[PDB]
Amino acid sequence: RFGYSFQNFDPKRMARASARDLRISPKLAVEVCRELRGMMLNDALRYLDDVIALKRPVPLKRYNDSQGHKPGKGFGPGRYPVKVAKAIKKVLLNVKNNAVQKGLDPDKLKIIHIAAHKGPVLRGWYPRAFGRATPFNEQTTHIEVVVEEIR
Amino acid sequence: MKRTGPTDPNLRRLIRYLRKKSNEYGVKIWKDVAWRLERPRRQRAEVNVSKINRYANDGEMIVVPGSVLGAGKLEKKVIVAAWKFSETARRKIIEAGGEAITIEELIERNPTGSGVRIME
Amino acid sequence: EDINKKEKRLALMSAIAATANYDLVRARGHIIDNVPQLPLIVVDDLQKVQK
Amino acid sequence: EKEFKRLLRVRARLKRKKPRFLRQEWWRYPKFKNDPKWRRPKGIDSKMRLKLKGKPRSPSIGWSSPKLVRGLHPSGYEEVLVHNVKELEALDPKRQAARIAHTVGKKKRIEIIKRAEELGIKVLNPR
RNA sequence: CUAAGCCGCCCGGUGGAUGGCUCGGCUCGGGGCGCCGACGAAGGGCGUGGCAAGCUGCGAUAAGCCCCG
RNA sequence: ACCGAUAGCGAACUAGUACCGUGAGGGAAAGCUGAAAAGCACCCCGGGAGGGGGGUGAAAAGAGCCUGAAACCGGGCGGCGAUAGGAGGGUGCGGCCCGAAAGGAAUGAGCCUCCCCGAAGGAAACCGCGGCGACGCGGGAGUACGAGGGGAGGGGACCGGGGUUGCACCGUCCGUCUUGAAACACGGGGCAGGGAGUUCGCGGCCGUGGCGAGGUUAAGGGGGUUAAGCCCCGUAGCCGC
RNA sequence: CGGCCGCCGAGACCCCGGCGCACGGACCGAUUGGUCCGUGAUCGGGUAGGCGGGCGUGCCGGUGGCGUAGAAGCCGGGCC
């Protein structure tokens, strides 16, 4: 995957980055992106740091089966996707670098578009009772992000 | 099953001309011959010089809405008009002193079709 | 598919006759605007042309 | 022209009132929704086959347009598909309108349009 | 400026249909040609390339050696 | 006048190969960059995979490479959205939204005003009378109105169509055996491709065409041809008399 | 319970315009076809089944064509 789903990208005012074939949960990636959308880059990085440190739960709105609630208001199911947070943090650092190279003030960068997709699946099998072999697969994730220097 | 009618464009045109001529002259002979000609091909009439000899008279006009075959003998002098003639049939008609013409020529000679006898 | 010999002969006759029909020839698409006459009969010397 | 206009209006009203005839359960499955069509219901218990009130209707011979204006362009002309200038040359400007085939390139479309406009021939897709 | 959720369009991922192509198949009247082996056959095993695993070809002279065109 | 990569031989390719069974034996999947590798020099970041610039190319067609559909998933946009019930639809219209082209239209749209004819059908005011009463009878009147059919003036850009949703009424899915299917009867997670009255021999009929007291050739032979096409003969035989 | 007076209510019945079918008639097109007129209160539901016409796909013999000024294919939309 190379293309982005953003329509009106402007190279003069915007920067973009992506990651492909990440070996993380696409569901949790979608959930984290939903929360990161619309935030400033620094705020998003601090958000991810808190999630990684387990100081801040991520709410679950779509994939939340058999998930317990968390202390405070708005919870409701939540969890701490550390691996997803780490990968997305690396992508955010990459896009920050792209903006800096283009010559955009890093303190005014707002995440205008961020999305996650399901990529290719790596197949595997696991043995089970009664001589049956059963699917045992990894689902990879694509991440895309484009930030804009607001004014 | 459907009756597709004659496949011969000449025969179809002859049928149309026959009906038109009947309307023009206010008679029924030509329309009768037309609906007899449009009979199914497995039922088209075939007549023999023997039958013509049996039921005709000298100097008479006969119309066969089909084919005329040359089995038997002819001794009368008759003018016969039919869609087709076999070689033997036509030879016998000519040798008897008559003439073997087509339906178009019969109409041209006798537009009103008075005294013409249909045979099937 | 079988074809009776006499029926095939009649079909050949009809085709040869239709060859000399002005309306059919032009209706088939052929350009006969400058042809002098249909049917076009030519002297036997045409048989010896080799080039 | 009086009867022509009356029947043209009648056809317009009829074909505005007419529905889109689609097979049963077309909306329920993507395989049918992506390829809209009408198929006669032939089931023993098919409600559409029974023609019950409250179910989609079926095509009938009574929906046909009036004979005089059947198949005509809504503008009233008779459509003729044209692929070249020679084909366009054999058209009647007073009663027929030329529709340029979708396959002819702009190069030939230029001459087709020029000939049409100098002959006073209506073109439905002049570009 | 509605949380979840449903329908429609656009973009993107997943997937490999469709269209086009074809050194491959299949079927044929006619035509050609039809045996090899104790002077060791067919079939097979193992070897053989500078980097060489499969296929193909070759046999300790081993992807080859000699002679006439 | 064969198929065109789920087709055609099982094998278009390192296919009777990989792999399965002790064995006899069984047996797949898998074609395509571009005209030319010109197959991305250099720069920033990342542990790396890669990402972003910048180059090549008519076009990334970027090797995970012709075209790139459907099902499925993520985002953006338009409509609905936490007091509301029916197989997810039908009829009619109202909100909100899209409306360049292919549909109508400035040679004039929605719309407003005025005049004429008018089928089936069809009032009332008002007046007279009958009935205990609901009410009815005669005049008004076959008048007003009426589907639709025509003409004139004003205004100047929308009507048709589409997405979603609101309301009123109606609507218990599809195929099947069955007397009877919404069925607590059977088959129905979704999408794409494949999939089921074919060939010969004999007999009965019909639609059409040739010849006709006759019809027709089979095996085969000759001419010509790139060729198996084309032309001519061939009375054995078969049926009818 | 015995009667009466109004009104509402179908695709039924009446009227207007349109389509097809059955039968008969007149015209044109060189094979099954096309146009128009007349009659229908005595034509218009439909399972098994019978008959007629038409739509669509691959290849062949002809005929007339399109295309790098952009074919097939694919997504959305307009018209018949």
UniProtKB/Swiss-Prot annotation, chain A:
SUPFAM superfamilies xrefs: Ribosomal protein L22
Q: Which keywords appear in this protein's UniProt record, sorted alphabetically?
A: Ribonucleoprotein, Ribosomal protein, RNA-binding, rRNA-binding
Q: Name one GO biological process term.
A: cytoplasmic translation
The entry lists its GO molecular-function terms as: rRNA binding; structural constituent of ribosome
Please give the subunit comment from the record: Part of the 50S ribosomal subunit.
NCBIfam families xrefs: PRK04223.1, uL22_arch_euk
The protein, known as: Large ribosomal subunit protein uL22
Swiss-Prot record, chain B:
- The answer to whether UniProt assigns keyword Ribonucleoprotein to this entry is yes
GO MF terms on file?
Answer: RNA binding; structural constituent of ribosome
User: Keyword annotations for this protein?
Assistant: Ribonucleoprotein, Ribosomal protein
Which SUPFAM superfamilies does the protein's record reference? Ribosomal proteins L15p and L18e (SSF52080)
| Presence of the UniProt keyword Ribonucleoprotein in the record | yes
Q: Which BP terms in the Gene Ontology apply to this protein?
A: translation
Q: Report the SS bond pairs.
A: none
* Annotated GO CC locations: cytosolic large ribosomal subunit
Q: Which domain of life is it from?
A: Archaea
Q: Which Pfam families match?
A: Ribosomal_L18
Query: Which protein family is it in?
Result: Belongs to the eukaryotic ribosomal protein eL18 family.
Oligomeric and partner information? Part of the 50S ribosomal subunit.
Q: What is this protein called?
A: Large ribosomal subunit protein eL18
UniProtKB/Swiss-Prot annotation, chain C:
Membership in a protein family: Belongs to the universal ribosomal protein uL4 family.
- Function recorded in the entry: One of the primary rRNA binding proteins, this protein initially binds near the 5'-end of the 23S rRNA. It is important during the early stages of 50S assembly. It makes multiple contacts with different domains of the 23S rRNA in the assembled 50S subunit and ribosome. Forms part of the polypeptide exit tunnel.
Task: State how it assembles.
Answer: Part of the 50S ribosomal subunit.
Q: Which residues of the full protein are shown?
A: 103 to 153 of 255
Q: Which organism is it from?
A: Pyrococcus furiosus (strain ATCC 43587 / DSM 3638 / JCM 8422 / Vc1)
- What is this protein's record name? Large ribosomal subunit protein uL4
Curated annotation (Swiss-Prot), chain D:
State the CDD domains in the record.
Ribosomal_L32_L32e
Q: Name one GO molecular function term.
A: structural constituent of ribosome
Where exactly are the transmembrane stretches of this chain? none
State if Ribosomal protein is listed as a keyword: yes
List the GO terms this entry assigns under cellular component, sorted alphabetically: cytosolic large ribosomal subunit
Kindly state which keywords UniProt assigns to this record, in alphabetical order.
Ribonucleoprotein, Ribosomal protein
* Domain of life, per lineage: Archaea
GO BP terms in the entry: translation
PANTHER family with a match to the protein in the record: 60S RIBOSOMAL PROTEIN L32 AND DNA-DIRECTED RNA POLYMERASE II, SUBUNIT N (PTHR23413), RIBOSOMAL PROTEIN L32 (PTHR23413:SF1)
Q: How does it assemble?
A: Part of the 50S ribosomal subunit.
Q: Which family does it belong to?
A: Belongs to the eukaryotic ribosomal protein eL32 family.
- Specify the protein name: Large ribosomal subunit protein eL32
What gene makes this protein? rpl32e
